[PDB]
Design a protein around this nucleic acid. Structure first.
Lengths: 203, 133, 260
RNA sequence: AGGUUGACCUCGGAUCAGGUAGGAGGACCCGCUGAACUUAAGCAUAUCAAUAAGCGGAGGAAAAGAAACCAACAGGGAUUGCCCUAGUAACGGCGAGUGAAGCGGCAACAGCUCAAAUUUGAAAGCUGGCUUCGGCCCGCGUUGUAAUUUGGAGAGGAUGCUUUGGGCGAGGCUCCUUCUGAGUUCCCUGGAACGGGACGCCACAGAGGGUGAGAGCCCCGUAUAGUUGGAAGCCAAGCCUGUGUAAAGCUCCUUCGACGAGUCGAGUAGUUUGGGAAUGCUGCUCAAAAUGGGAGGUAAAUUUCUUCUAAAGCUAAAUACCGGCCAGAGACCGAUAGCGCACAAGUAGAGUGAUCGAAAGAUGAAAAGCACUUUGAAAAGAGGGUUAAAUAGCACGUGAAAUUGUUGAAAGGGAAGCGCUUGUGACCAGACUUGCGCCCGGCGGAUCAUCCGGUGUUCUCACCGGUGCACUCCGCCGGGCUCAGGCCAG
RNA sequence: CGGGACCGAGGACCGCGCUCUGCAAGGAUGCUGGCGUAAUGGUCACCAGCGACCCGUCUUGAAACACGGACCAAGGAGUCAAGGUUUUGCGCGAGUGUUUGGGUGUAAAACCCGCACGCGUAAUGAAAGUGAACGUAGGUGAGAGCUUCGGCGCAUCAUCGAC
RNA sequence: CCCACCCAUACCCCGCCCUCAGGGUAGAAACGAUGCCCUGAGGAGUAGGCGGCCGUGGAGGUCAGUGACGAAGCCUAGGGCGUGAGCCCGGGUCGAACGGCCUCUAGUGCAGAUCUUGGUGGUAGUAGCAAAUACUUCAAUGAGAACUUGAAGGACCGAAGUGGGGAAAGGUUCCAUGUGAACAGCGGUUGGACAUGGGUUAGUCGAUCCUAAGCCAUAGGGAAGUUCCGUUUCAAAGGGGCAC
RNA sequence: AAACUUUCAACAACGGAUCUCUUGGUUCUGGCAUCGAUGAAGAACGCAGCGAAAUGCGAUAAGUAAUGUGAAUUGCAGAAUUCCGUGAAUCAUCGAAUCUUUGAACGCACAUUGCGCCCGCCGGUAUUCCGGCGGGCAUGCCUGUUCGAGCGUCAU
């Protein structure tokens, strides 16, 4: 299983520039942080659940918050990308739980936000006052607003009187019955339709 | 140990730069120390040598010979001192080349550009000593 | 270069009665014409199996084995015979491992090279420093043209705590030949066992010797290894009462008389 | 005057006014076009390879890009790249072989502009010319130039609150510029100390190079904070002022809510792909629709569901880089090596031409590159200087072998060379030269034994100071004796 | 009981013995002479006696044929990468692998960090799917080692069972 | 048929080397235990397999290593060690660096390839240096004269020339003066060689103008395109005169 | 016996190996984005007191200006530099210029230093002739200007 039948020597990529590229990336990050100070170096991201049945046990960071999440948090969609919040217009909220989690995330960020006035001599009422502008800040939203609990807890404890009775017949029999019903959903519907037609014909 | 990224410790590049330096660089390369009296007078250790300076040879076979500098052969990286000569076969006098780092300057050829050089070198020396002290 | 030996137009003259079938440079009017080309035996040809940059230059080592080797080198640095066997002059050192008070190094106390040199002489690393100073020699070979001009011995290694002792001692110790510095949380096996030989002479600060236990507690995934031998004194084991009381009587001596 | 006088439309001229393209470069990038050697036993599928060559077009990156996406989940959410997915799903004569994608972790993240609407109470828009810089004209344009809207919506209403314009600017950063520590101290070798020895000194500087031989301190530089002088930008703590004619955001709603056509799609042909049932592209023929259309990797009908919203367009970064410019490095090569080229090398030379294409580094620290005499027509030779050395003479550091000359020794009646063993001749390495121990005699000294104190140790052994007063210890010199000593032999 | 040749390994004692004040008994000592240097010994050149085909290479079973070699110096040919496999050393061990990346640095080094992922921890079937204890994880016969001397029995092999 | 004798690397005894095998060796006065001591057997070798050592360039460590009072290299009828590859020393030459030990690393070891590049022999002072009829005397120059010059002779080309001029091609070879080497397959004072200078003058001679066979723009049409056809075309392709 | 051939040695030759050296290659890393009708890359021809080449430059020709430095250049010759300075130098920097004939190459051509056309200026007796000098004249396409053509559509 050796794929060396093409002119492979023309397209060999070595990586001797790995430490140099790491140094260049760190220099670029330092320059971006110095240019963006006192703002954090990154944008606030929502918590999303990974697709497919393999990865839906785990949550991670998404692209941006939804318009519904911004509306429920009270943050206008034009103000949001100017105060460090990422916006994603494609994503929708199919269920209430993720919507509530991301709305609470936005409200925590809004409670921790310090908003400097556009003009120092003319502050507005949406702006943070000068007596509150001084506080210990964070510069990594991926760290301070990360995924705290990416998986469910793998172990809890309950009293022995709170042990559930379980599904009737057993979980194995419940799984077998669910698979059988899914396989026979159409045949039983056709049989019921034929029986109803026969009953209507010979009532 | 060198630190700055623009400094090269390459022997090949250093020798190339030294032996292909232009004339204004070779003037600085052909620097000579001052005597003890001139150092305590001017607070200056070294200066680029020039024609008309009086020097004393402290290295080589012509040690303890003194004389005025009559030529600064920058192409050969050498100076000529008066009466530090040899005879050819015919007996005619030919000057003997002395590298400027083998001599010590005993009397500077003084003009206002030279006083400006000495004054700014001295002022930099006292500024550096005061800042570090 | 991948094109070396192949920037030439050459073709074989075929089987004949006169010359070998190596390809020969075409054309005429010059010395190169009719000369052999492309062969590893040919002058101005291509070398056999030309060297490539995708050779394996780097070696991946298990981090646990790196930590094992570093711990072994640190343990070997506390054995005074191993320091002499590695060539350090430690006859005037008052104690091994040598721990200096952090008041003598912290802040700017040894930020000057004269102060650092005086401290080394006072604590007893002086003969090792002068050994390095007198050991300087010109290297034999082409390393002189390739930028490795001189060779000298290794001297003491100063280990300090950057949090408590600061970092001006690095500048203070920098200009002394053979003296190296290293933070206690970033110990280097290439310094702890120079040339693969155990027993580097180390001068510790008290802050570093305090912080070493926390340093080895903070290494996650690694524990200090258990030895396969509990008692290294083989003479004590062999000449103990427990072994000797159950042995068979000797069946001979170290020298055997010739019978016939 | 009407057989005239004009308005438009289309098409022309001008060395008209103002502009623009071409060629180079092409490492990397976007397309087009496109092999064969090879590998399959051979060989028209295949593989090499959607590669080389050929053609067109860009930039510092290019391209791609804000879903007619992935999915089938509790759903993710523009593009690019790395790791993984994965040598997996899949494709494949007579099998050699080929081969993705979604998810997941990371690097980097940034979003938007049109067409389809009547400004209709006012083309509100714009090129050019002349300007007194206030504007004024020639025009473009209603076959539509501004404002408004782009599906995330929006339009119309309702409703009550919020939003905005300028000008200084401390200070900081970027780039050139002035300046930076310490021995030429004494002795020896040497032509020359930069070598050896002694005594110092500097070090945020003991990188590198030069100087008549290995130099931290002779010289240039090296380290570090700063410190002179200058220019152009950028960031920025704050500070002065105008305020609502107008524009903008938020919340709710009966209603309305335009959304790209020879295009999508279908058939067929060629090509391509893992998608030879499920891929893309192009040509020809047919040719759409309005909850429509596309996709949902097995063909079709019926009924559902899920996802987006094509046929118009812009956009930094993470990514590439055998070209160019600047710089720093190496367990690389050391003049038959390393680029073909360390040199007046893509040169000299060759070919009609396309093109082909070398050889070739080193006197000495300093030319001090041999004055002068003499022999020769000269080249040169001999003396004699120069040099530390001419056993370095511009044939030049060192100067191997093949091969040659002279001198010395030897052998040789159709080969020499070689092995074992003597002999002769020539030339050599060792070994030996005396050691140790007793008995006398003569000297020169008390680090003889014991005891005392101090100290160290292995805790009973030693060291140091006092005591020896010479039948005791230690050296030296004369004799004598024993033993052991080199080579060959009986 | 004579005559001759070659050899002298070992290095306190220990042993077997005998003819037992000692010895010829588990390996040479004693006495004497010349010389003490090219005398012995060695190297080179040559003569003499005896011995002795020109080297690879190819072919087949082998020779012969054939092919290469005027001489000397310098280059001059089983290398590197990826992926397997067995064996050796090492770390950890039902886990293992820091190095895509991030942090950090005296800056291509060294040190540190963790999510995912790879391989392993479960197989079988075309697939849907199902998924490993009757028993001190079984019985019998061997089996190193241990044993309280009755037995317990590792690894491994053979055979019969169980899932 | 009988007696004696000769000698193989075979057999017997002894020494030494190596390999294999079997033993001994710690309340260590004890050891490169990877050592030492005792005993026995065995010894050919292609393809092939394995082990140990020697050597070369470079790297880390170390030897307080060697060195201008002479490193490296080279020569050596001079020696010592090793079974061996090799190692070490002496003498001579020479002039600036180099080596030992343990690890690391590789462009790491030559007699061959009708190799590669460079250099050098025997052949060998040999094969030749023999087409185009032919040379000789005196003087001068000069270190030196068959092949320089002048004169004196003798010959040849024999007008389809060994003559006098041109086209192509060359490019200074033309002329004067001077000249060591190299070249002129000998010789050279001579030279188309080498060195320094000088020399080519046009209204009338050619070019320049014209068209020939032919070639290339334009209009226009093909071609992905580099470009292909087209040269009178399916082009608004321009001259003159007059004017109260 | 010599000579000759061969062997061994010393010195001398031949040749350029070995050793040591390296202003050069080779590979890796880091930084930067900047050719041309305002005439590029490339080519030719010229330029120094004494140069053939390499280098630099363009008739302002081994260079001019400007800025900085501050006393050379050097093979020879000749001159320096008021050294207490508008200043040497084959110096460095570089913002102002010069930049022959060409070449995408542009009046038409070019195997020719060939042939033109337009507009100015100057000189030679010069309204006519001769000569010199300066500025222009390529193609495709865009925007605008101005002059036009056609029963193509109309109005009058």
């Amino acid at each position: 299983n050796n794929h060396f039948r093409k002119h492979w020597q023309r397209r060999v990529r070595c990586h001797f520039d790995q430490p140099g590229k790491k140094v260049t990336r760190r220099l670029a990050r330092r320059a971006k942080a110095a240019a963006l100070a006192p703002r954090p170096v990154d944008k606030l991201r929502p918590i999303v659940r990974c697709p497919t049945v393999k990865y839906n046990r785990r949550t991670r960071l998404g692209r941006g918050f939804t318009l519904e999440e911004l509306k429920a948090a009270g943050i206008p969609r034009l103000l949001a990308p100017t105060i460090g919040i990422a916006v994603d217009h494609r994503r929708k909220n199919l269920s209430e739980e993720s919507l509530a989690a991301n709305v609470q995330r936005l409200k925590d960020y809004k409670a921790r936000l310090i908003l400097f006035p556009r003009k120092s001599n003319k502050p507005k009422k949406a702006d943070t006052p000068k007596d509150q502008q001084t506080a210990e800040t964070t510069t990594s939203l991926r760290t301070s607003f990360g995924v705290e609990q990416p998986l469910a807890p793998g172990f809890t404890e309950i009293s022995k009187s709170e042990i559930p009775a379980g599904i009737e017949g057993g979980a194995y029999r419940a799984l077998r019955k669910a698979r059988s019903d899914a396989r026979l959903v159409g045949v039983r519907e056709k049989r019921a339709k034929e029986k109803a037609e026969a009953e209507a014909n010979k009532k | 140990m060198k630190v700055r990224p623009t400094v090269s410790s390459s022997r090949r590049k250093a020798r190339k730069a030294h032996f292909s330096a232009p004339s204004s660089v070779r003037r600085v390369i052909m620097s000579a120390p001052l005597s003890k009296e001139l150092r305590e007078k001017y607070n200056v250790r070294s200066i680029p040598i020039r024609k008309g300076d009086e020097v004393q040879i402290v290295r080589g076979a012509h040690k303890d010979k003194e004389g005025k500098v009559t030529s600064v052969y920058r192409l050969k990286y050498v100076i000529h001192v008066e009466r530090v000569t040899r005879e050819k076969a015919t007996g005619q006098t030919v000057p003997i080349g002395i590298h400027p780092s083998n001599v010590v300057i005993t009397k500077l050829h003084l003009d206002k550009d030279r006083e400006n050089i000495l004054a700014r070198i001295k002022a930099g020396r006292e500024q550096v000593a005061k800042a570090k002290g | 270069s991948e094109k070396a030996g192949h920037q030439t137009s050459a073709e074989s003259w075929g089987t004949g009665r006169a010359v070998a079938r190596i390809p020969r440079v075409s054309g005429g009017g010059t010395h190169r014409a009719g000369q052999g080309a492309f062969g590893n035996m040919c002058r101005s040809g291509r070398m056999f199996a030309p060297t490539k940059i995708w050779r394996k230059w780097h070696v991946k080592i298990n981090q646990g084995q790196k930590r094992f080797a570093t711990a072994s080198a640190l343990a070997a640095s506390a054995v005074a015979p191993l320091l002499m066997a590695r060539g350090h002059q430690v006859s005037t050192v008052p104690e091994v491992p040598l721990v200096v008070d952090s008041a003598a190094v912290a802040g700017d106390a040894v930020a000057k090279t004269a102060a650092a040199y005086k401290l080394l002489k006072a604590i007893g690393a002086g003969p090792d420093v002068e050994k390095v100073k007198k050991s300087k020699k010109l290297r034999a070979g082409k390393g002189k043209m390739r930028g490795r001009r001189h060779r000298q011995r290794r001297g003491p290694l100063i280990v300090y705590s950057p949090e408590h002792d600061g970092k001006e001692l690095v500048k203070g110790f920098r200009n002394i030949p053979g003296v190296e510095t290293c933070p206690v949380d970033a110990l280097n096996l290439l310094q702890l066992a120079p040339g693969g030989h155990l027993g580097r002479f180390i001068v510790w600060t008290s802050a570093a010797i305090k912080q070493l236990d926390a340093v080895y507690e903070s290494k996650k995934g690694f524990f200090l290894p258990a030895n396969i031998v509990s008692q290294a004194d083989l003479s004590r084991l062999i000449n103990s009462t427990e072994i000797q009381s159950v042995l068979r009587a000797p069946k001979g001596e170290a020298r055997t008389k010739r019978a016939c």
